[PDB]
Amino acid sequence: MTVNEMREWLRNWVANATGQSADAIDESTPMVELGLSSRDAVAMASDIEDLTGVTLTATVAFRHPTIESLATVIIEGEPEPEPYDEDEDWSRTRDVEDIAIVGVATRFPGDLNTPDEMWEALLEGKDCVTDLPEDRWTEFLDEPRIAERVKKARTRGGYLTDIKGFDSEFFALSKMEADNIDPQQRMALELTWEALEHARIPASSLRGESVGVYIGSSTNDYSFLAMSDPSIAHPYAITGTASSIIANRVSYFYDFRGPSVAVDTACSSSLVATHQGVQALRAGEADVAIVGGVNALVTPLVTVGFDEVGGVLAPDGRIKSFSSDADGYARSEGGGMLVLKRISDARRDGDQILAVIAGSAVNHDGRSNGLLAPNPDAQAEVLRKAYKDAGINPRDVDYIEAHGTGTILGDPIEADALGRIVGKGRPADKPALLGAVKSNLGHLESAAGAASLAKMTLALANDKLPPSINYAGPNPYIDFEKERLKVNDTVSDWPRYSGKAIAGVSGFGFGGANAHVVMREVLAGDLVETEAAQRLLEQAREELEAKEAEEPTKQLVPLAVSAFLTSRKRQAAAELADWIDSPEGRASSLESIGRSLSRRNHGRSRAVVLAHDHDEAIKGLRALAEGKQHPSVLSADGPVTNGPVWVLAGFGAQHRKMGKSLYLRNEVFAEWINKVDALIQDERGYSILELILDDNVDYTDATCEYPIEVVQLVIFAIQIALGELLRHHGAKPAAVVGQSLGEAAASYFAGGLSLADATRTICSRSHLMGEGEAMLFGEYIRLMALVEYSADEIKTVFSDYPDLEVCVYAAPTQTVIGGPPDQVDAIIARAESEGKFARKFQTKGASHTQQMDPLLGELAAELQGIEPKPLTTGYFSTVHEGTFIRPGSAPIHDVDYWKKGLRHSVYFTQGIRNAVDNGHTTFLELAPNPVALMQVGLTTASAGLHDAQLIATLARKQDEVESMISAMAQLYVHGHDLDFRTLFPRRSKGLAGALDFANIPPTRFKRKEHWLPAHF
Amino acid sequence: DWSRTRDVEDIAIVGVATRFPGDLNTPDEMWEALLEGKDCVTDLPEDRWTEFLDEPRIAERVKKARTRGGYLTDIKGFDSEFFALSKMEADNIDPQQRMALELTWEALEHARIPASSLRGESVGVYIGSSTNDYSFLAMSDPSIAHPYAITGTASSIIANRVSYFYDFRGPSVAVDTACSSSLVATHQGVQALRAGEADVAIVGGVNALVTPLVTVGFDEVGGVLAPDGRIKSFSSDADGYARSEGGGMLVLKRISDARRDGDQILAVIAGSAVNHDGRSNGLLAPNPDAQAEVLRKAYKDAGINPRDVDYIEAHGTGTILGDPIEADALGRIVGKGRPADKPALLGAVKSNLGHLESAAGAASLAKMTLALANDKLPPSINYAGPNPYIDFEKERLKVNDTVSDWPRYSGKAIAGVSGFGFGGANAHVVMREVLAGDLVETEAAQRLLEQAREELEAKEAEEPTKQLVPLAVSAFLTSRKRQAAAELADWIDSPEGRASSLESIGRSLSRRNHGRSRAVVLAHDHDEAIKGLRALAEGKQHPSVLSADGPVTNGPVWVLAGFGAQHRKMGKSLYLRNEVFAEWINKVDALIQDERGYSILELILDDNVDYTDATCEYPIEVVQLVIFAIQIALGELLRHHGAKPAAVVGQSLGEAAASYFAGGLSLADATRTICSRSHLMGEGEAMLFGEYIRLMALVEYSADEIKTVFSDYPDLEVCVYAAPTQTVIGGPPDQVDAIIARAESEGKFARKFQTKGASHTQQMDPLLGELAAELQGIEPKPLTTGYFSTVHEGTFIRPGSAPIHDVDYWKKGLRHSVYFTQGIRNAVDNGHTTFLELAPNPVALMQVGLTTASAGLHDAQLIATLARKQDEVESMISAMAQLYVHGHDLDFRTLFPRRSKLDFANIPPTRFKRKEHWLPAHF
């Protein structure tokens, strides 16, 4: 009895069981489809045995539902094991980069609103499916027809707890606008914030950047509520319920300038969105990608429809994936989102990489047996494409996060495809572990991919495999042993068949769109790639090691708190103070607390608490929580309009140990001193670093060979270093102004002269004043003095003394004048006649006077060769009568410019006032000691500005590291450019780094109820 | 530097389909309307929105709205039968899905790509759609609504249903950016094709105005819709826009693939970009900075300097504040550096059609594709004068309000297409025209060959041969196939048909879909075509028409017989008139020359070679080699056209060719088997004389009936089991001369052969030793196709089994009987019904016919290839046509190779039978 001899009785008996002719039966169709039931199958079980002897199992009598296949499988018997190419090359054909996952956000049933909550629930095997809440769908349960039809439906599923809540104020929306916004859009906004917070990327740092947004969704269900009254509906509903706006509104609010797209494949939407994000990042075209999906069950229309179809929804509402009692699924609402970057960028930016996406693929079923019928051939193809894209042999996969919808006919098809690709070649003792998060949460339609990706990311990061629940036993129509698969129904360790963890995530649309994403764990390989001056430096470090062992210095930690409103900023401070006082806060280092805050959003209203230990932090945060001003708290209700002005003064700002402490305790500051020292050594032939580190150098002729000359060079060096230290932290001036010696540094910071050429100007200017002073004696001397006269009032007082000339226009009521001593000793009395202020300087450099006439010739010679450049920032030139020079204008720093400044007066007060008229209010003083900030204060008050920001950098009798932190904190509080993250550089790799960050409280939202009132 | 930083390939546009207002249902119709400056905006049709105008509140609110726009003429129509949908299912399908199905068919037809050729292939589908408006109709009664509405009105299904129906296996996605959706969909298609991941891409967008809800909302906003409904783009009287419905679609390929496949390239997409406004001054406010950035990104992707652009197809919505913003961005990027005499020309198809919301990008791309293909610039209409807030001279822009030539500022035409969503998503696509550079990258035998060609040039100049053109007609139903034939006959009879070459008509048909029900009309001129198509239009069977109502279940069986199929000039004509056939003869000739040392091509081309001892030195030997050579060439000619056997069977000499076509032996090793077998029978015959001779004969006895007749004669043995009632036997002449009378006693049939090779007899015993020696070194391989071995008792061997063609196999076959009838019957039991005979003359098809009838098969397909007294080129065309008609693998496009760089005729397009499908709803 060969195949055909067995092929007609099958055609006979099936006719015997269906009353058709001998050969009317067709061998190219399942026998069950011919009106055949499974009841006769067991009746046929013996028939084949008594007639032949071979016994049909459920799996074999299922994978061969046709007659011709049935006839051969009995005669021959599953003789078609296809060979395995054990040597296939699974390497990448295109040179592409792996993608890093750095952030995860979750809204899933069961109140799983954080990755930590989700991980705990998964390890516990929590079942998040529940009955319909009493408060949901009430807009429809007020009509008996729909009410009784809904009551007849299944209606169990995964529901959210607060779907009507929304912080409209936080997202800057009016009540009428917020009432008309689909909850899908609300989830997208909230999840984006949470994901960036989880990734420790300040949202403010990404504004204007090329960030892509790809979100999947498949139902505009909130639209139906707006059609309750096709006249009362407000035009806000158009933007509130449009699918495209789900992504466009996220881009709008966060100021993302990358691609913004809404995808729809209806159960693989999140995976497909992840695919576009990965492809975008690989092709340039985007630097960060936000990928995810959302789903909301706002009306019962789709649920009732699926119930009407029949045999789709599980009666008890539990998805029993790959189980012998699988009987359908239940719908769920929620959302999830991931932050993606290229792995090199994440490594370069010091981001914690949770997992790596190696590759992905997308395809379609084609003409399957029906539109809604899955096709195993297409599923096998998408698996193959994904693993060729990832460059990973499927034999090495450890875990498959499956579609797993719990349908008794769909689960075998998924398992068949997996065995074709992932199971071939494996020994029976190395099976791919299998599971589905749909068993926990239900069928999150357009968020299933997001749920699956979130689960696997946490599994790889936390190094454990959570169980799949609702598993009574293997599905009879799946031979798991042959397919080399095993359902993980308990908490398990990663097998690591290849030495590293590898997972796959699958998602299949009901229309036939398939996707697969390949993930792996992050590896360790993904995180790689003068003579005498020394003596003073050596002793200085050793002299410091003794002063610290005897009494260690408590480090000053700046704590940054911010929000979009001052009211919320105070509340955030109060909640942070309580957490620090808590034992968890006490057990955390103050530097780790600061580091975590530095990576939070830096909003419009900012505040900084300068603290040394926990207690000072609490006592400062409490005061900030109230309106109590406190000296250890810097605060401001909003930003300033214009950028800062850097004031490069420095005449008279010398003291004994200026610059020493910062040089030893700051590498960036020390690096720039060394560069300036080298250049000065070339020009002059002596090292100023020797002068700085020495403690017996009082910068006086009693202890310096050329005090007039070295003082100017040292102060110049400090100005360059301080300015380049601020730039290291992200600070940049909006305009620059100098006073009689900072014009050299001012020219550098304004982009006019290079650092080398600027060093020549000061070097030449310094020593020429050195010999100029010595060469004269007696009556050829000129003195310098300060008087309480105004510029206009000098105009009518030099008739008394014609030799006198104005040197610096310090302030509206103060002016520096100089000339022969006989005309300066007396004019001090002339001022004292009217009870005015006067003072005589004790330095005889006599700059901006007639004494510089013999020096002008040499200055032109020594400066011949400097290359002026156009200006990159505003410039209030005091040489040119305090006028303003716009950025990008023609070069001005030619030799004639330097000749003029060393000869004529300094229009300091005019330049300042011009800056105030331009709207500038913040003035930053780069000097070893603030001597000009008091002068700038006078001009601003006179100009009608009694709240100017005057920021010092270093000061005698004050610690230097603390002074620079305080200066940088002030710039941050007023909204000026400053990367606060730079103040907390990572010192560990992340293994030993884990404790780099503290578990500070998360941003809190004030949710309000927003919904549409509707009926029928 | 505006050069490409990534090594990527340009994308070719090969097909366009259109549903646009004004009854613009073909690219040709659309082009005519554009050149005319047609205004396609109209008032609301009386039959639209009637589901809502039955309630006074909505009625008076709708009557207050603008409501003018671009509407379709038949939105309720749908050929549900063509797309295999039930009435209840078809009633619940959004018109957006209907457009997608219809446009895909039309685009592939315009591209001359048979839809059947793309089934199972990696084709991506990216369609932009932004509203689910048909869903609202289904909510009229939140209880009466049928579950079919879920699939009928879901956005994802707009693309998934297209993939399902056409069997596309690439990515299938629905995109939503709401006015740049079509452009964004085009972006994904381009990116997919560049990254592998897809071999063809279907990109487009659709939009339908099913309900008045969105229109009334936009009217409620105020200051958005134009009072008169005319979009006056970039004009001084711009006052808003009007909504429109429609769809469009493009077929995209990598340019190398289009060049390789011989597709007509209409235009080339060089690059594209997508970005977002960011925080603009309001969600609905366009941002010129972002628009400038997307232009820059697109032209860096395309590797083209924007200064060289000739034409910009702008968003151009006609808003008096939005048009200046668009012009500002264009001047920033596209206008900088241009002299005042070289301005970028500017226009907008929205002035013709209105604002096709998610189909605007499709409309714009279709316009520019036709403009580049047809080499003209159509005017932009509704232009009274420049907008006062735009300085066109400074921006270096000029509105094209008349038909114009391409300026070609760079020597070639370059255009840009822009699209901006109301949510802030921007896109730009850079296009250019196709260039000419995109379309590149024995001694004595000669004498007989020379004279043969010259002898033919004389026989053709005296009377040229009328070429036989096969005309292919098909459809999914036989009823529609007949209607298509009737319409095609009328077009051929028409003057336009008479003015078209018959080869061009055939070429066009060869690139149409090859459906389930197929028919071929073999014609020499127009008149025979008409007279044949008319008969096919009816049920009248006609000898010049091959037809079949459906496909066959199993693939063909190739029968490699050949004993007794020799005649004088076999293989000569085809060798001279078919290069592929000639190429394979030359390859076989070389191998035989190595094995034997003489060229059979000399034998073929010679006309005095009757394949007899009177004119051949070794007639027993050369005949087998020539027949073997023809079988290889014919089989490789069929494979050249896409034919492939499902199983193979041979008869006593085709086992050599059978082994080759089944994958068991290579062509070289197979040539050794026949070469060794041939000459060893050559000397074996000569070495014996007199009584040691064995004769061969045919008798009307059956295999079982021989079992009780060899008692009469023990020396006799069975050679070939020809048929159930016929058997070839051989032995000593005294036992064969008489047994013929023994058969004649019962009035049975008998015949004595006149060839004394005496194979499969005892005469081959001395030869078996040499055969093993000469064949030592052949490498058997597993089987790639089914194999009904006649050596092994006619049993079936499944593909992929262990090699069987070892020396012992060849020893057996040359010694023992041939189980031909058993092998045939086993094939019939496996379900095979088509039998193809590769031989110079059909001698075994009559034998196969007897076995099939005996097995209960009175409708078997028995196809001959060549026949004495019949033209050879025509015979092979007829053979290939028959395989096609029954559904077997055959690329009909190969029969019409492109000869030029008028190749195609303007045959009528596929016709649809539209029926009204809609939902009955109120309130």
Give the structural domain span for A336.
Answer: 99-525
The dihedral formed by the CA atoms of B103, B108, B112 and B113, expressed in degrees to the nearest 10: -170
Q: Do A367 and B119 count as a contact with CB atoms less than 8 A apart?
A: yes
Q: Are B174 and B156 spatial neighbours (Cβ–Cβ below 8 Å)?
A: yes
Q: Which residue has the tokens 């390939």?
A: B9
Q: Which residue has the tokens 């007199």?
A: B690
Q: Do B163 and A263 count as a contact with CB atoms less than 8 A apart?
A: no
Let me know whether A34 and A151 are in one domain: no
Of residues B357, B403, B350, the one with CA closest to residue B376: B403
- Beta strands of A313-354 (E only): which ranges? 331-332, 334-342
Active site residue B355: yes
Residue A430 is classified by DSSP as: S
The binding site of B for (R)-4'-phosphopantetheine comprises 373
Of residues B794, B755, B539, the one with CA closest to residue B651: B794
Q: Are B71 and B234 spatial neighbours (Cβ–Cβ below 8 Å)?
A: no
Alpha-carbon distance of B184 to A714, in angstroms, equals 60
Maximal CA-CA distance, chain A:
139
Residues 6+ apart with CB under 8 A from B597: none
DSSP H/E element including A571: helix A566-581
Alpha-carbon distance of A746 to A752, in angstroms, equals 9
Helix A243-254 / helix A183-198 crossing angle, nearest 10 deg: 40
Q: Are A740 and A808 spatial neighbours (Cβ–Cβ below 8 Å)?
A: yes
Can you read off the two tokens belonging to residue B276?
């977002």
Of residues A723, A731, A733, the one with CA closest to residue A874: A733
- Provide, as residue numbers in chain B, all residues whose Cβ is less than 8 Å from the Cβ of A220: 132, 135
Residues 6+ apart with CB under 8 A from B482: B536, B537, B538
Can you read off the two tokens belonging to residue B414?
């370059």
Q: CA of A295, closest CA in chain B: separation in Å?
A: 14
Task: Quote the distance between the C-alpha of residue A963 and its chain's center.
Answer: 29
Size of interface A-B (CB pairs under 8 A): 218
Let me know whether A211 and A145 are in one domain: yes
Let me know whether A295 and A238 are in one domain: yes
Compute CA distances A779 → A437, A821, B118, B708, whole Å. Answer: 96, 8, 105, 157
Alpha-carbon distance of A283 to B273, in angstroms, equals 12
CB atoms within 10 A of CB B62: 20
* Alpha helices for B224-347 (secondary structure H): 255-261, 288-302, 322-333
SS3 A164: coil
Give the Cα-Cα-Cα angle B41, B51, B146 (nearest 5 degrees). 120
Give the Cα-Cα-Cα angle B773, B777, B779 (nearest 5 degrees). 135
Q: Which amino acid is at A380?
A: A
Q: Which amino acid is at B254?
A: R
DSSP H/E element including B590: helix B579-595
Q: Obtained via which technique?
A: cryo-EM
Give the length of chain B: 923
Alpha-carbon distance of B50 to B211, in angstroms, equals 9
Q: Are A474 and A360 spatial neighbours (Cβ–Cβ below 8 Å)?
A: no
Compute CA distances B744 → A155, B713, B739, B747, B755, whole Å. Answer: 87, 16, 8, 5, 22
Can you read off the two tokens belonging to residue B100?
């997608």
Q: In chain B, which residue's Cα lies nearest the Cα of A373? A: B164
Residues 6+ apart with CB under 8 A from B892: B470, B472, B510, B514, B884
Residues 6+ apart with CB under 8 A from A592: A995, A996, A997, A998
Alpha-carbon distance of B881 to B874, in angstroms, equals 10
For chain B, the 3-state helix, strand and coil shares in percent, each to the nearest 5, are 40, 15, 45
SS3 B631: helix
Give me the residue from B132, B169, B425 closest to A220, CB to CB: B132
Return the half-sphere exposure (C-beta side, CA atoms, 13 A cut-off) of residue A498.
Answer: 17
- Provide, as residue numbers in chain B, all residues whose Cβ is less than 8 Å from the Cβ of A227: 136, 139, 213
CB atoms within 10 A of CB A570: 20
Active site residue B641: no
Residue A553 is classified by DSSP as: P
CB atoms within 10 A of CB B687: 9
Let me know whether A172 and A315 are in one domain: yes
Compute CA distances B101 → B25, B93, B153, B161, B238, whole Å. Answer: 14, 11, 14, 8, 36
Of residues A576, A596, A548, A608, the one with CA closest to residue A965: A608
Active site residue B567: no
Alpha-carbon distance of A888 to A868, in angstroms, equals 12
Alpha-carbon distance of B127 to B124, in angstroms, equals 10
Compute CA distances A301 → A140, A370, B146, B229, whole Å. Answer: 10, 24, 10, 36
Q: CA of A575, closest CA in chain B: separation in Å?
A: 31
Q: Are A801 and A819 spatial neighbours (Cβ–Cβ below 8 Å)?
A: yes
Q: Are B649 and B658 spatial neighbours (Cβ–Cβ below 8 Å)?
A: yes
Helix B667-686 / helix B579-595 crossing angle, nearest 10 deg: 60
Q: Are A482 and A81 spatial neighbours (Cβ–Cβ below 8 Å)?
A: no
Alpha-carbon distance of A779 to A792, in angstroms, equals 29
Backbone φ and ψ of A815, nearest 5°: -150, 140
Alpha-carbon distance of A444 to A84, in angstroms, equals 36
Of residues B897, B892, B895, the one with CA closest to residue B117: B892
Give the Cα-Cα-Cα angle B911, B915, B920 (nearest 5 degrees). 155
Of residues B70, B110, B105, B69, the one with CA closest to residue B366: B110
Q: Which amino acid is at B58?
A: I
Task: Quote the distance between the C-alpha of residue B622 and its chain's center.
Answer: 41
DSSP B130-187: ----HHHHHTSSTTT--THHHHHS-HHHHHHHHHHHHT--S-EEEEE-SSSHHHHHHH
Can you read off the two tokens belonging to residue B765?
């015993």
Break-preceding residues in chain A (C–N over 2.5 Å): 529
Taking each continuous run of H as one helix and of E as one strand, the counts in chain A are 37, 28
Catalytic residue among B172, B233, B474, B652: B652
Alpha-carbon distance of A639 to A904, in angstroms, equals 38
Q: Are A299 and A132 spatial neighbours (Cβ–Cβ below 8 Å)?
A: no
Let me know whether A222 and A150 are in one domain: yes
Catalytic residue among B110, B355, B805, B917: B355
A909: left (phi over 0), alpha (psi -120 to 50) or beta: alpha
Let me know whether A132 and A46 are in one domain: no
Q: B116, B161, B164, B225: which to substitute to probe chain A, counting the most A Cβ within 10 Å?
A: B164
Task: Quote the distance between the C-alpha of residue A680 and its chain's center.
Answer: 42
Backbone φ and ψ of B875, nearest 5°: -65, -40
Helix B288-302 / helix B322-333 crossing angle, nearest 10 deg: 40
Question: What is the distance in angstroms between the CA of the first residue and the CA of the last residue of chain B?
Answer: 61
Alpha-carbon distance of A952 to A949, in angstroms, equals 10
Q: Which amino acid is at B396?
A: R
SS3 A356: strand
Give me the residue from A218, A227, A248 closest to B423, CB to CB: A248
Alpha-carbon distance of B172 to A272, in angstroms, equals 10
Let me know whether A128 and A167 are in one domain: yes
**Rg of chain B, C-alpha, whole Å:** 35
Residue B811 is classified by DSSP as: H
For chain A, the 3-state helix, strand and coil shares in percent, each to the nearest 5, are 40, 15, 45
Strand partners, A505: A401, A517
Q: Are B54 and B922 spatial neighbours (Cβ–Cβ below 8 Å)?
A: yes
Catalytic residue among A128, A267, A763, A807: A267
**Rg of chain A, C-alpha, whole Å:** 39
Residue B308 is classified by DSSP as: G
Alpha-carbon distance of A16 to A24, in angstroms, equals 12
- Provide, as residue numbers in chain B, all residues whose Cβ is less than 8 Å from the Cβ of A261: 175-177, 184, 274, 425
Can you read off the two tokens belonging to residue B730?
């051989």
Kind of pairing, strands A485-487 and B545-548?
A: unpaired
Task: Quote the distance between the C-alpha of residue A1003 and its chain's center.
Answer: 15
How would you label B380-412 residue by residue, b for 16+ Cβ within 10 Å and e otherwise? Answer: bbbbeebbeebebeebbbbbbbeebebbebeee
Q: Do B276 and A252 count as a contact with CB atoms less than 8 A apart?
A: yes
Of residues B294, B322, B334, the one with CA closest to residue B415: B334
Q: In chain B, which residue's Cα lies nearest the Cα of A513? A: B172
- Provide, as residue numbers in chain A, all residues whose Cβ is less than 8 Å from the Cβ of B221: 235
- Provide, as residue numbers in chain B, all residues whose Cβ is less than 8 Å from the Cβ of A365: 163-164, 169
- Beta strands of B725-767 (E only): which ranges? 726-731, 750-752
Q: Do A253 and B221 count as a contact with CB atoms less than 8 A apart?
A: no
SS3 B210: coil
Q: Do A235 and B220 count as a contact with CB atoms less than 8 A apart?
A: yes
Backbone φ and ψ of B563, nearest 5°: -65, 120
Q: Which amino acid is at A457?
A: T
Q: Do B160 and A233 count as a contact with CB atoms less than 8 A apart?
A: no
- Provide, as residue numbers in chain A, all residues whose Cβ is less than 8 Å from the Cβ of B213: 227, 230, 233
Compute CA distances A489 → A128, A322, A470, whole Å. Answer: 17, 11, 9
Let me know whether A299 and A179 are in one domain: yes
Q: Which residue has the tokens 């019904």?
A: B833
Of residues B142, B152, B134, the one with CA closest to residue A153: B142
Q: Which amino acid is at B191?
A: Q
Can you read off the two tokens belonging to residue A189?
């906004």
DSSP H/E element including A235: none
Helix A960-973 / helix A707-728 crossing angle, nearest 10 deg: 50
Q: Are B317 and B16 spatial neighbours (Cβ–Cβ below 8 Å)?
A: no
Count Cβ atoms within 10 A of the Cβ of residue B510 and give its class: 0-12 exposed, 13-18 middle, 19 or more buried: buried
Give the length of chain A: 1016
Let me know whether A63 and A106 are in one domain: no
DSSP B347-411: E-THHHH-EETTTHHHHHHHHHHHHHHHT-BPPP-S--SB-TT--HHHHTEEE--S-B----TTS
Q: Is the dihedral of CA A874, A879, A882, A884 positive or negative?
A: negative
SS3 A107: strand
Let me know whether A43 and A183 are in one domain: no
In CATH, what number is assigned to the domain containing residue A19? Answer: 1.10.1200.10
Residue B869 is classified by DSSP as: T
Q: Which amino acid is at A679?
A: L
SS3 B629: helix
Residues 6+ apart with CB under 8 A from B211: B49, B51, B52, B133, B136, B137
CB atoms within 10 A of CB A587: 8
Q: Are A377 and A513 spatial neighbours (Cβ–Cβ below 8 Å)?
A: no
Residue B42 is classified by DSSP as: B
Kind of pairing, strands B647-650 and B786-789?
A: parallel
Q: Do B425 and A231 count as a contact with CB atoms less than 8 A apart?
A: no
SS3 A106: strand
Let me know whether A34 and A175 are in one domain: no
Of residues A103, A97, A167, A204, the one with CA closest to residue A977: A204
Can you read off the two tokens belonging to residue B352?
């013709």
Let me know whether A273 and A368 are in one domain: yes
Alpha-carbon distance of B879 to A572, in angstroms, equals 86
Alpha-carbon distance of A557 to A590, in angstroms, equals 7
Q: Are B364 and B349 spatial neighbours (Cβ–Cβ below 8 Å)?
A: yes
Q: Are A712 and A902 spatial neighbours (Cβ–Cβ below 8 Å)?
A: no
Residue B206 is classified by DSSP as: E
Alpha-carbon distance of A635 to A267, in angstroms, equals 49
Question: What is the distance in angstroms between the CA of the first residue and the CA of the last residue of chain A?
Answer: 68
In CATH, what number is assigned to the domain containing residue B407? Answer: 3.40.47.10
Can you read off the two tokens belonging to residue A174?
């009016």
Q: In chain A, which residue's Cα lies nearest the Cα of B171? A: A363
Q: Which residue has the tokens 């398992």?
A: A415
Q: Do B423 and A249 count as a contact with CB atoms less than 8 A apart?
A: yes
SS3 A595: helix
Residues 6+ apart with CB under 8 A from B766: B684
Q: Which residue has the tokens 């070469």?
A: B675
Residue B760 is classified by DSSP as: T
Active site residue B315: yes
Compute CA distances B758 → A399, B236, B726, B763, whole Å. Answer: 68, 100, 18, 7
Q: Which amino acid is at B561?
A: A
Give the Cα-Cα-Cα angle A308, A309, A314 (nearest 5 degrees). 85
Q: Are A156 and A316 spatial neighbours (Cβ–Cβ below 8 Å)?
A: yes
Alpha-carbon distance of A862 to A670, in angstroms, equals 29
Alpha-carbon distance of B506 to B485, in angstroms, equals 13
Q: Do B147 and A269 count as a contact with CB atoms less than 8 A apart?
A: no
Q: Are B162 and B172 spatial neighbours (Cβ–Cβ below 8 Å)?
A: yes
Can you read off the two tokens belonging to residue B739?
């047994």
Alpha-carbon distance of B645 to B661, in angstroms, equals 8
Q: Do A252 and B283 count as a contact with CB atoms less than 8 A apart?
A: yes
Q: B176, B186, B219: which to substitute to probe chain A, counting the most A Cβ within 10 Å?
A: B176
Residue B568 is classified by DSSP as: T
Q: Which amino acid is at B841?
A: N
